[PDB]
Each structure stands twice: as structure tokens, then as C-alpha cells.
Write a protein that holds these residues in place. Structure first.
Motif, PDB file in Angstrom:
ATOM      1  N   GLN A 189       0.802  -1.212   0.000  1.00  0.00           N
ATOM      2  CA  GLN A 189       0.000   0.000   0.000  1.00  0.00           C
ATOM      3  C   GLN A 189       0.839   1.268   0.000  1.00  0.00           C
ATOM      4  O   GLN A 189       0.410   2.276  -0.566  1.00  0.00           O
ATOM      5  CB  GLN A 189      -0.936   0.010   1.210  1.00  0.00           C
ATOM      6  CG  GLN A 189      -1.818   1.236   1.294  1.00  0.00           C
ATOM      7  CD  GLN A 189      -3.098   0.988   2.060  1.00  0.00           C
ATOM      8  OE1 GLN A 189      -3.727  -0.061   1.915  1.00  0.00           O
ATOM      9  NE2 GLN A 189      -3.498   1.959   2.878  1.00  0.00           N
ATOM     10  N   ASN A 190       2.030   1.242   0.592  1.00  0.00           N
ATOM     11  CA  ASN A 190       2.889   2.414   0.679  1.00  0.00           C
ATOM     12  C   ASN A 190       3.942   2.459  -0.410  1.00  0.00           C
ATOM     13  O   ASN A 190       4.820   3.321  -0.355  1.00  0.00           O
ATOM     14  CB  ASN A 190       3.605   2.473   2.030  1.00  0.00           C
ATOM     15  CG  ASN A 190       2.732   2.055   3.185  1.00  0.00           C
ATOM     16  OD1 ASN A 190       3.082   1.164   3.955  1.00  0.00           O
ATOM     17  ND2 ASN A 190       1.572   2.687   3.304  1.00  0.00           N
TER      18      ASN A 190
ATOM     19  N   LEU B 151       4.008   5.805  -2.335  1.00  0.00           N
ATOM     20  CA  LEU B 151       3.779   7.050  -1.626  1.00  0.00           C
ATOM     21  C   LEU B 151       5.086   7.682  -1.175  1.00  0.00           C
ATOM     22  O   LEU B 151       6.101   7.012  -0.991  1.00  0.00           O
ATOM     23  CB  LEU B 151       2.868   6.809  -0.435  1.00  0.00           C
ATOM     24  CG  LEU B 151       1.444   6.512  -0.870  1.00  0.00           C
ATOM     25  CD1 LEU B 151       0.630   5.980   0.282  1.00  0.00           C
ATOM     26  CD2 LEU B 151       0.826   7.769  -1.408  1.00  0.00           C
ATOM     27  N   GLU B 152       5.045   8.998  -0.985  1.00  0.00           N
ATOM     28  CA  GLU B 152       6.204   9.759  -0.546  1.00  0.00           C
ATOM     29  C   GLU B 152       6.494   9.426   0.909  1.00  0.00           C
ATOM     30  O   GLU B 152       6.096  10.162   1.814  1.00  0.00           O
ATOM     31  CB  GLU B 152       5.946  11.258  -0.738  1.00  0.00           C
ATOM     32  CG  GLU B 152       7.074  12.227  -0.350  1.00  0.00           C
ATOM     33  CD  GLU B 152       8.419  11.910  -0.975  1.00  0.00           C
ATOM     34  OE1 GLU B 152       8.557  12.062  -2.205  1.00  0.00           O
ATOM     35  OE2 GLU B 152       9.349  11.540  -0.232  1.00  0.00           O
ATOM     36  N   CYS B 153       7.197   8.323   1.137  1.00  0.00           N
ATOM     37  CA  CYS B 153       7.471   7.866   2.491  1.00  0.00           C
ATOM     38  C   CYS B 153       8.366   8.850   3.234  1.00  0.00           C
ATOM     39  O   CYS B 153       9.319   9.393   2.672  1.00  0.00           O
ATOM     40  CB  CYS B 153       8.135   6.491   2.452  1.00  0.00           C
ATOM     41  SG  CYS B 153       8.438   5.735   4.065  1.00  0.00           S
TER      42      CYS B 153
ATOM     43  N   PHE C 269      -6.675  -2.845  -4.022  1.00  0.00           N
ATOM     44  CA  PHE C 269      -7.782  -2.734  -3.081  1.00  0.00           C
ATOM     45  C   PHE C 269      -8.885  -1.853  -3.645  1.00  0.00           C
ATOM     46  O   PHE C 269      -8.672  -0.659  -3.866  1.00  0.00           O
ATOM     47  CB  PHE C 269      -7.287  -2.154  -1.758  1.00  0.00           C
ATOM     48  CG  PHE C 269      -6.340  -3.047  -1.032  1.00  0.00           C
ATOM     49  CD1 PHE C 269      -6.804  -4.050  -0.209  1.00  0.00           C
ATOM     50  CD2 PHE C 269      -4.978  -2.910  -1.208  1.00  0.00           C
ATOM     51  CE1 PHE C 269      -5.928  -4.881   0.447  1.00  0.00           C
ATOM     52  CE2 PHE C 269      -4.100  -3.741  -0.560  1.00  0.00           C
ATOM     53  CZ  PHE C 269      -4.576  -4.727   0.270  1.00  0.00           C
ATOM     54  N   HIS C 270     -10.058  -2.428  -3.867  1.00  0.00           N
ATOM     55  CA  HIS C 270     -11.269  -1.625  -3.937  1.00  0.00           C
ATOM     56  C   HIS C 270     -11.845  -1.560  -2.526  1.00  0.00           C
ATOM     57  O   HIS C 270     -11.121  -1.773  -1.555  1.00  0.00           O
ATOM     58  CB  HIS C 270     -12.236  -2.155  -4.995  1.00  0.00           C
ATOM     59  CG  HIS C 270     -13.284  -1.159  -5.388  1.00  0.00           C
ATOM     60  ND1 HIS C 270     -14.632  -1.429  -5.328  1.00  0.00           N
ATOM     61  CD2 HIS C 270     -13.178   0.130  -5.785  1.00  0.00           C
ATOM     62  CE1 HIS C 270     -15.310  -0.361  -5.709  1.00  0.00           C
ATOM     63  NE2 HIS C 270     -14.451   0.602  -5.984  1.00  0.00           N
ATOM     64  N   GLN C 271     -13.125  -1.236  -2.384  1.00  0.00           N
ATOM     65  CA  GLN C 271     -13.645  -0.813  -1.094  1.00  0.00           C
ATOM     66  C   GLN C 271     -13.455  -1.858  -0.005  1.00  0.00           C
ATOM     67  O   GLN C 271     -14.177  -2.853   0.069  1.00  0.00           O
ATOM     68  CB  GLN C 271     -15.119  -0.442  -1.241  1.00  0.00           C
ATOM     69  CG  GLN C 271     -15.975  -1.525  -1.867  1.00  0.00           C
ATOM     70  CD  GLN C 271     -17.407  -1.092  -2.057  1.00  0.00           C
ATOM     71  OE1 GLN C 271     -17.795  -0.004  -1.645  1.00  0.00           O
ATOM     72  NE2 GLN C 271     -18.194  -1.927  -2.722  1.00  0.00           N
TER      73      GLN C 271
END
Ligand SMILES: *[C@@H]1O[C@H](CO)[C@@H](O)[C@H](O)[C@H]1NC(C)=O
Ligand SMILES: *[C@@H]1O[C@H](CO)[C@@H](O)[C@H](O)[C@H]1NC(C)=O
Ligand SMILES: [Ca+2]
Ligand SMILES: [Ca+2]
Lengths: 66, 139, 116, 69, 69
Positions: A27-28, A31-33, A64-66
Motif C-alpha cells: 500500500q505504501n 507514496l512519498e514515504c 484494493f477496492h472498497q
């Protein structure tokens, strides 16, 4: 510290190293960790991401959807 | 920026007022790859601390300016496009020039004219609920 | 030039007044006191949040405050239990609470009282 | 309320393990009834019991401290 | 120190008050090879600037402390 991947602690020059504070999960990954500073710990190798149990191949974490 | 990687803003929130629903923000950290690799924390007081060192305002650098304002706040600036305001007690405003008109991925959404796709996750589909929206931008 | 001599004397223990209306009296800002030696290990609200750093100071002849009050961050000396709390880099305010994931902290008087 | 000013409440069965207020959670175990409003557990009485105060417009309240007498 | 090279102090002096003999001092620079290579400049006001960047007091570092008195 624990097999089957290698470990690093810190070079500690002015603390850029990605320690246990920034563990790229699936998930990360993009992303700008953040990085408060290198902390000696354990991590899987760069071509890998952690899942709920351990680190499994990058091309198998669900989207991942909802 | 999410297209050319020219900045990124990351906020930290912690719960106030000994109550279930009151959640605040402590600090904002800005990253500017143009200025080598700079971290400029914004702290709970009027504090500014670039690369770990608390600094005394006003600050002038290659294209960055930080300075107090009249009403006891701060004002970070970058070249002609980016701008921020921040006064102590968790109230941040961020103005942005029409150059970044459609290239932005964040908790504020991309910056086209439609508010109907503002819950767009890093995967690609938009969510119906706000709860699952913000669990996608954790670090 | 006069004060250099008086400072040199004080290093040998001699205390001397030498100041009268009609010479360079310190012109202390209002709300403060010119009073002679006041052994400064307090008079700053920082010292309340960090009470265990050091206290080994000599006499200095500065500007100080009446012995019930402390100095504020911006320079005023009115506060008593109205002066803020310092924490890990930041500055908080009287009667504040916060709770991230590890600790619960409030701040009464000039100190924190973090728990957990 | 008596003549002396003593308060009393008697709740029922259908609130087992569901009450939350200052008389503590309703459960058989008597050791874990100082849970704060945030959901954690403490040991300090006043830290536990200052988390349940209510304010209403004109009336503002501070943090209470044990008497030093 | 001149024998182990632990510190070094330099002062800059200019002329004041439009006269032949009135000479003053402006600034002081201290070099401490212990703190890697740190240059701390002490300015005409009360300002302090370490490696070109102003700092806000108090400062704490390895063994280095600067503070208002
Ligand atoms: C500050 O420290 C001195 C040193 O003992 C003490 O006498 C004094 O009561 C303290 N507080 C104030 C407000 O001066
Ligand atoms: C009380 O409820 C919580 C949440 O349902 C549960 O974890 C706990 O075991 C319950 N306690 C008892 C004594 O049943
Ligand atoms: Ca949009
Ligand atoms: Ca109980």
C-alpha cells in the motif's frame, strides 16, 4: 537478525538511510514515504514488499477496492 | 506534483481535547527537490526548522522565502507558483498557480474543474465513502 | 569604561554600587527590576519545563522580576501560571491535551505531566 | 437523594459490558474499570476521571487537582 | 591551541567615529575542528550564524552551547 534476507543497521552520517521507520508495503510502495532518521532494524531486500505475514513477491499483492 | 516530482506536502494529525472525535494537526513538513534535498518542518508554535536546525526569520535562499506576517503567522514561498500559510494552531492554507492545472495526486485531489472525482485513490477507482478514502494516503 | 573596572572588581569579590541618577543607570524596561544580584537559574519559563539541567551561576547585576513571577517568551513578565509549556521542539499553551499513539500528555503549570 | 445528599443509581441486566460512564464499566472483573475515554487504561484516579467532564456554553472547567492538605 | 589544534579565534577590526585613533571591533569567528569543520560567526548585533545560516537560541550540539544571558 532473522532469515532469509540480509540486514543493515545505519551508516549514520546525517541519517538518510531507510531503516525500520520506512518499510515499503504494497500500500505504501509509491507514496512519498517519510524519513525521520535511520533506525537499526530488519527489512526485506529492495525488490520486495511486505504483506500481512511477511514479504511476498511484488507482483502478487492485491489491489484494493472498497 | 505527481508528474514531475517538484514538491510534496505531508501532514501529521494527533487527537486533542480528551474526546473521541476531536482530532487536530501538529506539524507540516515540506519537501523541495530543487533545493538539493530540503526538509522544512513547520511546528506547533511559530517555529521553522530546516534540516533539523531551528532558524531565525526571515529566510532567503535560491528560490525560497520564509517570513513572518502581520498577524503572527508564517508565509513560505517558492518561485511564482507555490505559497502557504500556517499559524500555530492547525490552520493551513495552500494557494497554487494554474501551471499545475491537472497534475496532482494527494488528499486534496487533482486540480481539474470537476468535483465529482475528488475521492480518487492511488489505485485508480473512486470510492463512495470518505472512510475508505483517507485510509489510502497513510504512510 | 567605568563598568569594565567594576566588572574586574567583582571577579575578586568586591561589590560596588557606583551608579547614581546622573550617570549611566541601566534604564531597565518597564515591568522589570534593576535589582542587584539575583542568581538566575529561573525567571525563564523554559526552566520550569526542564528542571534538571544545571544551576551553578554567579552574580550578574541584570534586569529581573519580582519574586512571584516569570518572564514570557516574547518578553513580558506578567505571567505566573499563565506561561506556556515546552516540549520536543514545539511550544504548547496552558491547558492543552494531545494523544498520538504512545503517550497521553497535558500540561499544568509550566511542566508537561506526560504519562504512558 | 437522601436527606444528607447521597446519590444512588440502580441499572439493569441488559446493560452488561455496555455502560461507560464514571461509575465505571459494568463487568465482573473489578480490576479494569479505570479505562479513559480514549479507550486506554490508566492508574491515576484524576487522569481517569477528568476525561469525563462536560462543558456547556457559559460554564468552562479546568483540570482538577487533588487537594494538598 | 597551536599544539593540538583544538580551536582558533579571529577578530575583525574597523575604524569608527571618523577619527585617526578610534578603532573598534565588529565580529568574531571561531573554528572548531572537533565539530567536523564548524564556522560560527558572532555579529555586531546579538546575532549568531553557523555555516552561513542564522540560528535561533538556545543551541545545543555535541559539546557546544550558545545561549542568551
Ligand atoms: C530562583 O532561584 C533562586 C535560587 O535559590 C531562589 O531563591 C528563588 O526563589 C527562585 N525563584 C525565583 C522566582 O526567583
Ligand atoms: C465486553 O465486550 C468486548 C467487546 O465486545 C469483549 O471483547 C469482551 O470480552 C467483553 N467482556 C466480557 C466479560 O464479556
Ligand atoms: Ca477533480
Ligand atoms: Ca470493571
Amino acid at each position: 537478525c532473522r532469515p532469509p534476507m540480509v540486514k543493515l543497521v545505519c551508516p549514520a552520517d546525517n541519517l538518510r538511510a531507510e531503516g525500520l521507520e520506512c518499510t515499503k508495503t504494497c500500500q505504501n510502495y509509491d507514496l512519498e514515504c517519510m524519513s525521520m532518521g535511520c533506525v537499526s532494524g530488519c527489512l526485506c531486500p529492495p525488490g520486495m514488499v511486505r504483506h500481512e505475514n511477511r514479504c511476498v513477491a511484488l507482483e502478487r499483492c492485491p489491489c484494493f477496492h472498497q | 506534483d505527481c508528474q514531475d516530482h517538484s514538491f510534496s506536502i505531508v501532514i501529521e494529525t494527533v487527537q486533542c481535547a480528551d474526546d473521541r472525535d476531536a482530532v487536530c494537526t501538529r506539524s507540516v513538513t515540506v519537501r523541495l527537490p530543487g533545493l538539493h534535498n530540503s526538509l522544512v518542518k513547520l511546528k506547533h508554535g511559530a517555529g521553522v526548522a530546516m534540516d533539523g536546525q531551528d532558524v531565525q526569520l526571515p529566510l532567503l535562499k535560491g528560490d525560497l522565502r520564509i517570513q513572518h506576517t502581520v498577524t503572527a503567522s508564517v508565509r513560505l514561498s517558492y518561485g511564482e507558483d507555490l505559497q502557504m500559510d500556517w499559524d500555530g494552531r492547525g490552520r493551513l492554507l495552500v494557494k497554487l498557480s494554474p501551471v499545475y492545472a491537472g497534475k496532482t495526486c494527494g488528499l486534496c485531489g487533482n486540480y481539474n474543474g470537476n468535483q465529482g472525482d475528488d475521492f480518487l485513490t492511488p489505485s485508480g477507482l473512486a470510492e463512495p465513502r470518505v472512510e475508505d478514502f483517507g485510509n489510502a494516503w497513510k504512510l | 569604561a567605568l563598568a569594565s573596572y567594576a566588572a574586574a572588581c567583582a571577579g575578586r569579590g568586591v561589590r560596588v554600587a557606583w551608579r547614581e541618577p546622573g550617570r549611566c543607570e541601566l534604564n531597565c524596561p518597564k515591568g522589570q527590576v534593576y535589582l542587584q544580584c539575583g542568581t538566575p537559574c529561573n525567571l525563564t519559563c523554559r526552566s520550569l519545563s526542564y528542571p534538571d539541567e544545571e544551576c551553578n551561576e554567579a552574580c550578574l547585576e541584570g534586569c529581573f522580576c519580582p519574586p512571584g513571577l516569570y518572564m514570557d517568551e516574547r518578553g513580558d513578565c506578567v505571567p505566573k501560571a499563565q506561561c506556556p509549556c515546552y516540549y520536543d521542539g514545539e511550544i504548547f499553551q496552558p491547558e492543552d491535551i494531545f494523544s498520538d499513539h504512545h503517550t497521553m500528555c497535558y500540561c499544568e503549570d509550566g511542566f508537561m505531566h506526560c504519562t504512558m | 437523594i437522601d436527606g444528607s445528599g447521597n446519590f444512588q443509581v440502580l441499572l439493569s441486566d441488559r446493560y452488561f459490558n455496555k455502560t461507560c460512564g464514571l461509575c465505571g464499566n459494568f463487568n465482573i472483573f473489578a480490576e479494569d474499570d479505570f479505562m479513559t475515554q480514549e479507550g486506554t487504561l490508566t492508574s491515576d484516579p484524576y487522569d481517569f476521571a477528568n476525561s469525563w467532564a462536560l462543558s456547556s456554553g457559559e460554564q468552562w472547567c479546568e483540570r482538577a487537582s487533588p487537594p494538598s492538605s
